[PDB]
Each structure stands twice: as structure tokens, then as C-alpha cells.
């Protein structure tokens, strides 16, 4: 019997919130990552944009005060931790990476808070932008395959 | 004058151990979940992981043994035995609770033993996610609300 | 008077309850911490009074068998010291033979919480068996 | 060439020890059954009991536990394998057996468990009783009559 | 690109068999060395006799013919080659040794042909007696302990 | 299983 304290906190007082997500039950929905259809070997690196689940653009943080504040942008790696995603019937993984500018070159580093800016009276973008490499060796099987990124907004 | 009986044991063979603790005094300090800061009403949920005291991540739960054993975790309802973090000093109260899943579904229940695996040569972890519902009606005062989980590892 | 719930008549004796630490190995880093469990229900052990003005009474624990606070290994000759708190911050100790006080209002039954709570032994590796130990809790007026 | 394999293992969880024995070499020397000095044909039974090498008394086998734990006692047959001493020089032979109750009755058979009790914070001494018949028929040759019992306190 | 030659032999004449093993899938199962049980300190050289997979007893190796073939037995160093049996959870080893005489004296030094008699119409039995020295320093952690030994019957 | 030796001896002489 090894019982132990767990100090729980909120501070409320002038913070910041997400725009652009749904409460799917008690966890927030973002958005979706649809790369769309392809076949069994692309030559094309496939790329999408992160669509949030209320509005269907990007997701628009806006904070809540009159000071520019700071906040930071956090993405895990997926259910699996490593960029993957799966098929929903078969074993077959799907390696993917998330970048936050428009030229795939700025990666949202796992677990890294990657920075930015939001003024008053202003709502900012979070452009999660998706790319697939090339497979031009193994044809993945048939079906649909998935992936759950947790982005963590936070301060 | 009631005279009574406390009969009290230990039997010192085989066990398990938490780890990720720190001894606050007499009382193992398991953990913080920090919601972070925010405004008098937050329209997304807010959520938070509990960052083990020692390590500063996740608690991990390792048993002294070969054999696989498959140990409980319980959490009970906080100070008040209703989880709600309490203003320091105005009586404002904020409901919440912890549960066991990343998608918020797996509620760790008020006193009960959510059943965990442990295996060979190895460290479990122990989620504890915490979630906040949107408080879209009445702004609670500014300050610091608290409260104090004990979350019991017990065989 | 004063009556204290949550006990059985063990023969002559009140028996209040358990203070279960549970299942251990010879060396623990972790505090191990439990509460007691009453034996008549297996809850807290639930002290009323009788009457309708709040009544103040007390609760005094004793030093355990060797009235040093060991358990005992029921073959060998190994210890285990421990000690029982009040509160569930293990801050507030009983300290041994004294009258810990306490409320009660009519219509209600109040709590005693006893909380158990072992060192963290990280030196030698006491022998492997059951330890025991039977602390006396006198409700007294 | 026959390459074969051969599994070992030891379970170190919770045992039992026996004391009163030296390590000789790598070999426990448990004791000495010493019937002492005797002529060429003797009419009584020679009879002595064995004498622990570390002590002097019995072998005192305490268990590691504090339940009661039941181990068995066996015997071999000696060196020939039929319990009989041998002449250091010559072939002559000295038919002998161990009992395990004073009274010469309870015979330790060749190869068997003879079950034993041991108790809470306690050493159970075992009795390893010599006994040899009355040779009132030829006198075997002068010298020293030798034998190595192994004894196996087995689980 | 090496590509090369391993010339595979077979001499099909008048070869010696080993009796007392079962065939695991393609290996030979020989035998087991089982110390039994034990606590995390013994005193006393915890030591036990191989146990034949197929009967219960000795290997018993016979030789087919009718002149008296001299056959050796070579033991390995078990599976880290060093003879230590080794946690199945943890990394905790036991060192051990197999002797060939009853007295723990005349060990099978690894890799070594130790030599042996049979005649016809006999079979003759391989002692690989265990043996572990007294651990009187550490107590090795709770759990199973294991080594597979290659025994070597070649002619 | 601790497997332990005991010597067993008798001096025919006198």
C-alpha cells in the first residue's frame, strides 16, 4: 500500500485560448490532417494542411488580454511516438511528420515547444502542415489508415 | 473509557515500488497537475498531465520481482471528496477530474482500483490526465485554486 | 456517555480494527503509508455520543506491544518501526499516551482517522515473514 | 559428435539452510559417524552417531522462514553403494546402516526422503543414528574401516 | 560478394550412442541441473546432480560394438560462457561449476575433453555434478535463475 | 538441495 499526494493547480487569472476546436466528450477536438486518397507507391511527397473540427480553416488562437503574449506550440508524436500512422485492419505503419511553415522546412520537433506571437484583439494561425515521403519501394496495403496527434497548446 | 484493538501488519516478501516520488516529510509527494494559467471563463476544457516531483515526468511504477504482477491504482475525490480545486483564499470552487486514457474516456472512479500490468525488468507508468470542463457561465475570482489528489498504489 | 463505533467484541476486548501497510520487500524506498480499517464495517472506525449537546472527547493510542511503535516478525526477532498520524498528511502525530482531542455533535458519527506510516528503509533487508504489532486505542472522556 | 543441452536453475525466492557443516573444498562436510575402536569379531552391536564437523552435536538445519517449512532428509548408500566400510589396505568390508529414531528402528532407505519438520525461530536437529550387526563369525583384517555417506538435504 | 566452401562429413561405421536424452525439436535435451530452491544469502555450497530429461536419472551413454570404446564428454560455458546462471527479469548472475566426481573435485574445465570408458553391453552414466559456492556477501534479487550448458559427447 | 558428505569409520584392532 504505497499511497502518495498529487498537488493539483489552475491559476485563474489572464489567459490565453484555442479557437478552432470541438469538444469531442471531455477531449478537444483540433482538427484533421487529410492527406486524401493515393496508391499503393507514390512518387509525390503527399501534403496536407491540419483542418480545425469547428470552422474547417486553420486553427485560430486568439489570447485574452491587451499585451502581446508569448505562447508556444507543442505536437507529440502520434499514438505510436513515432509519426506513424496505422492501418486500421492490418500492421502496416505510414511514416509522416508535421512542419509548421508552408515550405516543409521548420519541423514541429516532438515534445518542443516550438514559439509564437499573438497580439490584442487579434486571432493567430497555427499552421500544422502535413508531408508524407516518397514510397517507392513497398506498395502499403489497402485501407484506411490513421493517427491521433495530441497538440498542446500551452503557456 | 473505550479501550480498543488496533491490529497492525506488514509482511515483508515480495513487493512492488512506486517510483517518480519524493518524500514530502512523512507523505510521498507523487505529483503535480498544472493546468497552467487561464481566464475567468475558459470555453475550451483545459488539460493537464501530472508531472512526477521527482523526475518530472510520468510516475513510473516498477515491482521487485521476475514474474509478471498486476498491481491497482486508485485515486480518491480530493480535499473536499468531490475534486474541485478550492481559491486559496476566497471559497470559489473548480470542478475537475483524472483520468487514466489520452482521449479523456477511462475515468479514474472516486476510491476504486483502476487495474494496471507490470513485466519483467521493467518500469510501468502511471497516467494520471487531468481534464477541466469549459466554464462558459460564471468568471471564478482571480487567484490560485489547489487541491491535493492522493492517489494510492495498492496491491 | 460516549460510544465508539465501527469495533467488534473480540472476547473480551474491543477489537477497533486493521492497520494493513500490505505486501513489502526486504528494502523499500517509498514510505509505506495505510489507513486503518475498522473490523466491524472495514471503513474508518466511527465514533458517536449520545446526547444532543456537542460533546468534546478524546483519543489517546498506546506504544504497541513493546510501547516503542515495532512490529514485530512473528518467528524472528526483527523490527519495523512505525507510527500512527491523525491527519492524511502525516504531520499530526498521535503522540503515545496522549488525548489527541476531538468533536461530536448530536445526530452524526465522527471519524478517527488513524494513519499508519512506515520509514523508508534503505539500509538492511529485514527478514522475509509477517510483522505485527496490536496497538491499544483508548477512547477516553 | 552428440552435442546435447542441459538446463539449469536455482529459484532464489525463500529457502532453507543447514547448519553444523564445514566446506570441504567445494564439497559440504556434514559430519562423522564414528563407531570407534573395535577387535576382530565383536558380539554387541557397535553403535555411535554422527558428530557435525562445524560443531561437534548434531546437524542443526534451520530454515530461512518464519511458517513452518517440511524438508525431507535423504541418505545414499556409501561409496560401494550396498553401506559398507571398506579396508584403507585390503578388500575386507564392514556391512553398516544409519537409523533415524534412538532406538535403531526407523532406517534412513537408500535414495528416500525421510520428511522432517522445522519451526518458527528454531534449528531441527538431524539424527543420523550408525548401527552394525554383530559379526560373531569372521574376524575381518586389522586396519581402518572407511566410508563416505553423502547425505542430501533436498527440498 | 566471398563466396565459399564448408565440406560436410559423416562417417557411417561403428559409432557410440547417448542414452537418457529427448530430442527438443532439433537439439538433443540432455538433461537438468536443479539446485532448487534458495534464499538471497546461503551459507552452505548449494549443490545437485543432473537429472536426465528422459528418465529421471543419469545420462546413461552405451556404445555399439563389441571392443571397449574410450568416448570423451566436453561441457561448455554455458550461455554467456562464463557459467552464471542468469535472471530471467533482471541482470543478476550466479556463478556455478559442474564437477565430474562426487567429491566436487575433478571439474569439467570448459571446453575439454574429459575422458571416459564403455564396454559392450553396458551403458555407462555421466556424473555432471553442480555445484555453487557459499554467497555470503550480497543478496542476489528474487526470481528464477537459468543457464542452458552444451554438453559435447564426441568421439 | 545441499548434498553433504559424512564419514563413516571403524577401527578393527583391538
Chains 1, 2, 4, 5 share one sequence.
Not at 515534445?111 to 494561425?125: D, E, I, K, L
Amino acid at each position: 500500500a504505497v499511497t502518495g499526494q498529487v498537488d493539483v493547480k489552475l491559476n485563474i487569472s489572464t489567459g490565453c485560448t484555442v479557437g478552432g476546436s470541438q469538444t469531442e466528450g471531455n477531449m478537444n477536438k483540433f482538427g484533421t490532417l487529410n492527406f486524401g486518397k493515393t496508391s499503393g507507391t507514390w512518387n509525390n511527397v503527399l501534403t496536407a494542411e491540419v483542418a480545425s473540427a469547428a470552422t474547417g480553416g486553420n486553427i485560430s488562437v486568439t489570447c485574452d488580454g491587451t499585451d502581446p503574449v508569448d505562447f508556444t506550440v507543442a505536437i507529440d508524436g502520434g499514438e505510436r511516438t513515432d509519426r506513424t500512422l496505422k492501418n486500421t485492419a492490418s500492421a502496416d505503419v505510414v511514416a509522416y511528420n508535421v512542419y509548421r511553415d508552408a515550405a516543409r522546412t521548420n519541423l514541429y520537433v516532438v515534445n518542443q515547444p516550438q514559439q509564437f506571437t499573438t497580439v490584442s484583439g487579434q486571432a493567430t494561425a497555427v499552421p500544422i502542415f502535413g508531408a508524407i515521403a516518397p514510397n517507392t519501394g513497398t506498395p502499403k496495403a489497402q485501407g484506411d489508415y490513421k493517427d491521433t496527434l495530441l497538440v498542446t497548446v500551452n503557456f
